[PDB]
Design a protein around this ligand. Sequence first.
Ligand SMILES: O=C(O)CNC(=O)c1nc(Cl)c2ccccc2c1O
Ligand SMILES: [Mn+2]
Length: 221
Amino acid sequence: LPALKLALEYIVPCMNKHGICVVDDFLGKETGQQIGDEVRALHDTGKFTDGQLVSQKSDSSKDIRGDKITWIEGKEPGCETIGLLMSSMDDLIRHCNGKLGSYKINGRTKAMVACYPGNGTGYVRHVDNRNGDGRCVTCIYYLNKDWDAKVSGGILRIFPEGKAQFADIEPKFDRLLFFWSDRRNPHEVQPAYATRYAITVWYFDADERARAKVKYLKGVR
Ligand SMILES: O=C(O)CNC(=O)c1nc(Cl)c2ccccc2c1O
Ligand SMILES: [Mn+2]
C-alpha cells in the first residue's frame, strides 16, 4: 500500500481527529521478521543496557531492572532493516507534512529500541514531551509475533486528555502506532510477562524545537 495513500486516507484524518493512530501489517511478514531478527541479534550480542533500575534493594544482587534500550541510527552493521523501517516511517511523515495539525516536522531522533525482558516490569504513566522539548509525534513499531495480552500483559494504555476512557494497544507484530507526544497523551506500559520489543522514533516540530534551544542552554566567542 503506497505511503501517500496511507497518509492521506488514514494517518492524517485519524491523527487530527483522535491523536492516536494504529496501522496493522505495516511492512509485511518477511520484512517484519527480518527486523525482529536484527533486534534479537542486538539483544543477544549485548548491545542493550541492563535495564531501568526499578527496585533498589539493600542487597544489589536482588536489584530489579526493567526496560532495556539501545539507540540505533539505522546504518550500523546488522541494523539495515531497522534503517529501512526508519526510512519508511520518514516517508509516511513526509507525506503528512503540513497536514498534522499546524505542525511542520523537520527532524527526528535516532531510533530507541526497547526490550521489556518479561519479568513483570512495565513503564510508569508518563508524558513523552511534557516541557516543550520539540517532539510532537511519537512513532512506535512493534515486533512481537502472536502477542496475546491476556497471557503476556504488556499492553500500552493511553489516557487521552479529557476523555473518561483509555485506549489499550496490543504490541502486535508489524503494528505501527502514531500519537501526539505532548500532555494530550499520558500513557503507560502495563507489566510484561514475555519478552516485548518495540522501536520508537520521535518527530520534531520546527518551531518548538527552534525555541527549545533558548530555554535549554551552543556558545560562541
Ligand atoms: O513500548 C510501548 O508501547 C510504549 N513505551 C513507552 O511509552 C516508552 N516511553 C518512554 Cl519515554 C521510554 C523511555 C525510555 C525507555 C523506554 C520508554 C518506553 O518504552
Ligand atoms: Mn512513552
